[PDB]
Amino acid sequence: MREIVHIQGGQCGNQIGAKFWEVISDEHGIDPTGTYHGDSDLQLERINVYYNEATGGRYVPRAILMDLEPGTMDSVRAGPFGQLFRPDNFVFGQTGAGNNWAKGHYTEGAELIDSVLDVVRKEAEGCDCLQGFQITHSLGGGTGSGMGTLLISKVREEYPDRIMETFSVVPSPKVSDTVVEPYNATLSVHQLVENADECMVIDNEALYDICFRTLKLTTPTYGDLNHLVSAAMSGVTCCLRFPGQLNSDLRKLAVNLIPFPRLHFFMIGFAPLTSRGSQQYRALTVPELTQQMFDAKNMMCAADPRHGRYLTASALFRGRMSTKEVDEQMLNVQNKNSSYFVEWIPNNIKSSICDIPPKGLKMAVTFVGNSTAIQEMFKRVAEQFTAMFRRKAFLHWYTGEGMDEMEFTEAESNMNDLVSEYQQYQDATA
Amino acid sequence: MREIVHIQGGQCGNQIGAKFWEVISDEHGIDPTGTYHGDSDLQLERINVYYNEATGGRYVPRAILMDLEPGTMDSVRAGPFGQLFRPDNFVFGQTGAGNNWAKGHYTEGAELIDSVLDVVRKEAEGCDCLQGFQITHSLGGGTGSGMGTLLISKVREEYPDRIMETFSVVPSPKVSDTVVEPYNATLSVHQLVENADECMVIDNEALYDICFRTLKLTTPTYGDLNHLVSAAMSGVTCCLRFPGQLNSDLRKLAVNLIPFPRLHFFMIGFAPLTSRGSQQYRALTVPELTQQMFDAKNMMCAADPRHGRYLTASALFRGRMSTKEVDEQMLNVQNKNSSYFVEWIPNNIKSSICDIPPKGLKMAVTFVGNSTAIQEMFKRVAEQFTAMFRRKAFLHWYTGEGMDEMEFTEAESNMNDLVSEYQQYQDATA
Amino acid sequence: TTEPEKKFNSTVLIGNWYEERCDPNREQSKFYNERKFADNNYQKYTLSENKFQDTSNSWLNFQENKPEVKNDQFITMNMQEYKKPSEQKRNSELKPFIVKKSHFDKNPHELEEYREKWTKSAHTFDRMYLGT
Amino acid sequence: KEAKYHSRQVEPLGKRMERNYEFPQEVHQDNFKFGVATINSENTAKEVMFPQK
Amino acid sequence: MREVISIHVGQGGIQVGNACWELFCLEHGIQPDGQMPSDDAFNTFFSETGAGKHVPRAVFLDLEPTVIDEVRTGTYRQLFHPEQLISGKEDAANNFARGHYTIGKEIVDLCLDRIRKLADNCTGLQGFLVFNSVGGGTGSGLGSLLLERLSVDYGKKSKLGFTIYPSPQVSTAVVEPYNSILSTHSLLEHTDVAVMLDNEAIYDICRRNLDIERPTYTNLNRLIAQVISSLTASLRFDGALNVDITEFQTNLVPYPRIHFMLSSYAPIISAEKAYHEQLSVAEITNSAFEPANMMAKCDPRHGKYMACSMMYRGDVVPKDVNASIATIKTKRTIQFVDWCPTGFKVGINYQPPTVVPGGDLAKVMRAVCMISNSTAIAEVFSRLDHKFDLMYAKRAFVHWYVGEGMEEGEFSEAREDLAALEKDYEEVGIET
Numbered sequence A, B: 001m002r003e004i005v006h007i008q009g010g011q012c013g014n015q016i017g018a019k020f021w022e023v024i025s026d027e028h029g030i031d032p033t034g035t036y037h038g039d040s041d042l043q044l045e046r047i048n049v050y051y052n053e054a055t056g057g058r059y060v061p062r063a064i065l066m067d068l069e070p071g072t073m074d075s076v077r078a079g080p081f082g083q084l085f086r087p088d089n090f091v092f093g094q095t096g097a098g099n100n101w102a103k104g105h106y107t108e109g110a111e112l113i114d115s116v117l118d119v120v121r122k123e124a125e126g127c128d129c130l131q132g133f134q135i136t137h138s139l140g141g142g143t144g145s146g147m148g149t150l151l152i153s154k155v156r157e158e159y160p161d162r163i164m165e166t167f168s169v170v171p172s173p174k175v176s177d178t179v180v181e182p183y184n185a186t187l188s189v190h191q192l193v194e195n196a197d198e199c200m201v202i203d204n205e206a207l208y209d210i211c212f213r214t215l216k217l218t219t220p221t222y223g224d225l226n227h228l229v230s231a232a233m234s235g236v237t238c239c240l241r242f243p244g245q246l247n248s249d250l251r252k253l254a255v256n257l258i259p260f261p262r263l264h265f266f267m268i269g270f271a272p273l274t275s276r277g278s279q280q281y282r283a284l285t286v287p288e289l290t291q292q293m294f295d296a297k298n299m300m301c302a303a304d305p306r307h308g309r310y311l312t313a314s315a316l317f318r319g320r321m322s323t324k325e326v327d328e329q330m331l332n333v334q335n336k337n338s339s340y341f342v343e344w345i346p347n348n349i350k351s352s353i354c355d356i357p358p359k360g361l362k363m364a365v366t367f368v369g370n371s372t373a374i375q376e377m378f379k380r381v382a383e384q385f386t387a388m389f390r391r392k393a394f395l396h397w398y399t400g401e402g403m404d405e406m407e408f409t410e411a412e413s414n415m416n417d418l419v420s421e422y423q424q425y426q427d428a429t430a
Numbered sequence C: 001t002t003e004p005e006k007k008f009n010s011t012v013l014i015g016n017w018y019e020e021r022c023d024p025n026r027e028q029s030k031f032y033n034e035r036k037f038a039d040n041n042y043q044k045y046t047l048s049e050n051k052f053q054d055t056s057n058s059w060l061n062f063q064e065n066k067p068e069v070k071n072d073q074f075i076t077m078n079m080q081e082y083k084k085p086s087e088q089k090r091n092s093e094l095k096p097f098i099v100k101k102s103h104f105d106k107n108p109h110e111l112e113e114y115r116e117k118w119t120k121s122a123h124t125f126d127r128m129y130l131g132t
Numbered sequence D: 001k002e003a004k005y006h007s008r009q010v011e012p013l014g015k016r017m018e019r020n021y022e023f024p025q026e027v028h029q030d031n032f033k034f035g036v037a038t039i040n041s042e043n044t045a046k047e048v049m050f051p052q053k
Numbered sequence E: 001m002r003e004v005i006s007i008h009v010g011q012g013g014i015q016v017g018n019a020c021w022e023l024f025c026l027e028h029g030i031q032p033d034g035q036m037p038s039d040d041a042f043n044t045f046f047s048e049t050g051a052g053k054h055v056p057r058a059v060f061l062d063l064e065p066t067v068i069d070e071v072r073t074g075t076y077r078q079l080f081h082p083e084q085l086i087s088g089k090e091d092a093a094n095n096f097a098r099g100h101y102t103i104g105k106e107i108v109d110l111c112l113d114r115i116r117k118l119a120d121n122c123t124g125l126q127g128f129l130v131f132n133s134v135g136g137g138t139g140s141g142l143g144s145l146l147l148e149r150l151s152v153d154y155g156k157k158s159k160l161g162f163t164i165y166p167s168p169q170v171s172t173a174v175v176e177p178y179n180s181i182l183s184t185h186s187l188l189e190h191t192d193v194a195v196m197l198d199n200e201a202i203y204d205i206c207r208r209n210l211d212i213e214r215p216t217y218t219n220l221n222r223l224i225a226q227v228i229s230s231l232t233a234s235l236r237f238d239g240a241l242n243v244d245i246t247e248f249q250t251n252l253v254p255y256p257r258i259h260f261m262l263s264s265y266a267p268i269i270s271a272e273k274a275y276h277e278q279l280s281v282a283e284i285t286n287s288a289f290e291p292a293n294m295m296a297k298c299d300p301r302h303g304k305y306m307a308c309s310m311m312y313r314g315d316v317v318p319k320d321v322n323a324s325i326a327t328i329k330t331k332r333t334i335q336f337v338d339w340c341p342t343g344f345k346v347g348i349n350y351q352p353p354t355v356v357p358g359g360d361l362a363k364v365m366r367a368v369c370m371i372s373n374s375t376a377i378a379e380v381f382s383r384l385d386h387k388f389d390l391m392y393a394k395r396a397f398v399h400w401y402v403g404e405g406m407e408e409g410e411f412s413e414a415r416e417d418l419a420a421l422e423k424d425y426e427e428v429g430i431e432t
């Protein structure tokens, strides 16, 4: 019911999903063999949101794994919780994109995408009444950044009324692993801004900062990063799958966070997060949950929120609590930081309450904020892009697969216009 | 049990038969003493096809050894596996033929053939249901080419319904051994088109170049050539002796390869052939076997098959494999070589499968082909015959036994008619 | 630059030597370690044989010396596949990707330690619905 | 008898110069393989949240 | 499913391929007879014969028989395929025209036949690796002819050249600048990626770090083999951040002409003095960039850096890699080109390095192999151009080349091409 499908591409997206599905299965009490073993009745109450049934009563996630190189699925199938996925749904090429946006979007991606589009169409008609699509991908990789956004365009052109969700891992310059992030990143985000209904950005360097500072563990890993990002994934939709005081779906968030159609880029955060040794010194209360949820250092992004003003914010509480404390403290935090909130939108914070907290915890909070501070990411990415492009470095390989410099000029002009438009409202006064 | 009897005359025929019986006994697990010491029970159901049963549990081949001189049989009896043949099936003269077709076909052959006819008739009504005859002989010699062909005529007169196959060693112009080849070669080749149901040509020059190029052995002898020919001829009747997925006998091959009664000349080939250095270093697969079997240089005849077009072909796969690959291989080779196949007849390649590979392998291929490039040997023989005949050299030796040049002229005329009528289908367009 | 006919006994590097060295009938096939492979004289005082490659005696029927060939050389499809429905198992060769045999299938013990490891572990479902 | 020339136990023919150390053989002999340490992985990684206790 | 084909030409290439093939076989656990004692990573280099052993995907070419025959009679007699070891009769004798115009034309057809019969078996061909010493006539000529044939026969497949240019002053031949410059002209527009391996640098590293004062050719070949294994291990071993062969030229080649890179490896310490220290990630990655450890005798301080791709193998961690790279960027002695804000590519693999029994190298967890495209490489081209000019001023040794059928004027074209190449380097190196 109001059902949503999962598809993923690129190795980063596959790694994210391989743990997001683990989190979902653990929350719903589903073993890796697909047989329910929970204790509560509410566990199967909305299993339809993500799971399908087969003969014999086993559950299968409706996720579609799709890319150009089979190695990552060869790894994940042997991995934990790899048996759930439908073996038909896997679609992989035999060449690979080589982190080249042209090769991932024009020559191999267009050729391959027919089968994955067909299986997406089948899964979309399968559900009773679709709610929308949600995507996990990284903007720094060729096949991800190109093929994923091409698939977004193809899905949008057929389903103009549904909701589109994207979790984009953008490349930060602090932790650089490739030489060609700016080109494919700006190329992907150009097409993404026109079609995606919602996109929220994640940063590896920010995740490293979180893991060093809050959890205080000496050896972080990609598994840890994926797990926390997956917790952020779940917290958005937990309210859609469990009863609560104020049910709020993806369309709820869409209507309540986006004032203008082109401003749909968000930054998120999760609370609480505590170190192992200090987990007993903290006494779980709504006040500390709020003060941590609004901490600048707790954001999952490189954007500094006090460098700009918040257009709007939204909070998803999980667990049992009174609404008076929540909304009164929301008023308190809005009043005490009135300088950081834009003035011509009074009462610009959403509250939603779900009665089922996550596993092992009593209270939890998921924060999603639309603010003007995210312009810095695009500024630095565009600076890197123009530095690389003014000398036409690494350019002829993009040109040799059907593109020209006109496309890149259009992309950079569009993104600079986007930044200018996004900062316009920051200084706007009533 | 649809048995076949074996007849051989002349030195070449005797040697070929001696090697063939060794090969068959090795395949069926028979000692030189005629005692069975096999392992599996599949070696006994069809043992009656080639071996008759005697007292004491022993087995004896149903083969006839015939010649004008005693030295050949004196050698073969002393050679290995000489104890299989009964002394009664030996039959020889005391004068010899001396490469004189007249002596072996008019004077001595006529007076001697009574005994061989008696013994072959005794063997013929020995079996319950005769399947046919197989002959191994050489045309370039005297006693074989004369007496054997006269015996062929007599046997065809006596048994019109049974099927007769011949393995003919023709004189090759390159490897010239005798000075009077063309005369008796033409005289013999005339007398086969009226009787022989199947004829398969073998060339010593082709055998030599096979051994020098593919096998890469420095000092080959006649034993290895005999072994090659024995394996090639034994692969023909594998399906008649062992169970398989698609059984095929000599009558099936004749009907399936003969478009017209006067086009019953074939070129055969064996696969896989490889040197001693590369025995373990290459893989046995249906694609490799079908690629090697169609090689132009792998044929057992000096003619170049890429100078003409095939009418029909037949392949007898041995071992255990998948039939789809076999059929798809024939389809692929037929599509990629449409220029080398006659067009007015579709699907001109036959497939047969037997489940018992030869001793010491796991898969093997016997290929039989009817193609229009076989006429080159006849053209060369005709040229030699005409050039040597215009001066009447050596002619008096033949005329000294009532032999006339009128039938020499008739023989060369009919052979030229064969060449013309057989090559006029090369350019025939429907 | 063409092939030379036999001039010297097999032991030299004249053209076409490798094949007759591989041939087992020749006495050349089988050489000695102290012949070449020698740092110095005093190291070893007794020979050892090393043999030249591993090749069968007969050029044809060369797949001999493999014990599997004799075993599977007298089996046909009928006995292979129609054995008995009681103790018959599938012999077809499926696609490699479909038979990956994931980690939990590889070792089951992880599976039953898991579940009570992380499934059904301390869920607290409290709902404030006035009727419930 | 020429081994002790002070030119053999140094600069030998394409081999290790004999810096004659003595390692502790009670360990270090079977499968030890250098390095600073096993880069000790932090205790608990993935259950810090959802503490299961 | 993923495979790469290896080509060896000239006795130097053969002798370095030998070292590569002990290392790969020992790494995968295959005995010299080719059988495996007791997943399918070997498919990158080997192919199953159907039942039992494995055969390498390599071809050896030479016009001189001694080295190929030593290979055929050595301890690896039972491994290599017998009819892919193509040997001629008469050696080119350091004459490039001999190996490029009269004798190699007769053997190139057989080589191409074998290449086709190897490539048809393969299905997911990643590319080609080629090994050849540059200063030899047959090596240069056959490398050039084979490369020119392959570029038109197969087209866009990636090709990697592991060339050993002459040392600055140390040399063996007396005419090798001529054939080196000619082969460089030939491969400039034919090779996607060429690496530098002048030997004197390896001698220096062996003398200093390994502390062997009289190294033999086997040690140099062993080091080169270790570098090759480091480069290739990502294809056949799982890793947290894998990189394919196709993910080299997409990140290392700013312009089509500029594709000559120089490599370094670390750590290089004997087991004698490695147990006494720790060899942390920061210090090994510093030693990797340290100028005297580069296996190319070029001073990186004399020019700018263009692009760096480094492979870590062992138990390395991405946080440690980022911490090290921040320090490398902070350091002042190393400066990058103006128009590349980020220039690093990083790969990580799990399977720690293997050690050959009786070898000089040592067995650690963490190893790093670094390949750098830099603007400083013009020095070697300039010095070879000078050595060529001094000899060609008076037409020394010209008759030995002109009497073999190679036209007199060809040297001027190569000279002009070298001038254009150094012009391109100095034009790229300037800032905006």
Ligand SMILES: Nc1nc2c(ncn2[C@@H]2O[C@H](COP(=O)(O)OP(=O)(O)OP(=O)(O)O)[C@@H](O)[C@H]2O)c(=O)[nH]1
Pocket: E009, E010, E011, E012, E013, E015, E016, E064, E091, E092, E093, E094, E095, E133, E134, E135, E136, E137, E138, E139, E140, E164, E171, E172, E173, E199, E217, E220, E221
């Ligand atoms: N590093 C290294 N360099 C080698 C090796 N063998 C030869 N060289 C170098 O190659 C140069 C000459 O080329 P070679 O490889 O010896 O011979 P070639 O290139 O095949 O040319 P020809 O001598 O005509 O056969 C010499 O100056 C050596 O420095 C080797 O095994 N390792």
Ligand SMILES: Nc1nc2c(ncn2[C@@H]2O[C@H](COP(=O)(O)OP(=O)(O)O)[C@@H](O)[C@H]2O)c(=O)[nH]1
Pocket: A009, A010, A011, A012, A015, A016, A099, A138, A140, A141, A142, A143, A144, A145, A169, A171, A177, A204, A222, A223, A225, A226, A229
């Ligand atoms: N969250 C997460 N990100 C990862 C992981 N592995 C790689 N990445 C990110 O993926 C980015 C590289 O993307 P890339 O592999 O080129 O994308 P692709 O071309 O679609 O495969 C890097 O910036 C990493 O931060 C992982 O396990 N988890």
Ligand SMILES: Nc1nc2c(ncn2[C@@H]2O[C@H](COP(=O)(O)OP(=O)(O)O)[C@@H](O)[C@H]2O)c(=O)[nH]1
Pocket: B009, B010, B011, B012, B015, B016, B097, B099, B138, B140, B141, B142, B143, B144, B145, B169, B177, B178, B204, B222, B225, B226
């Ligand atoms: N392949 C093969 N050919 C043979 C053998 N013996 C003889 N020949 C060929 O037969 C020809 C001579 O035949 P010949 O003995 O005179 O036949 P005959 O007069 O009927 O006995 C020669 O050209 C040989 O090439 C043999 O053992 N094997």
Ligand SMILES: [Mg+2]
Pocket: E011, E064, E091, E138
């Ligand atoms: Mg040489």
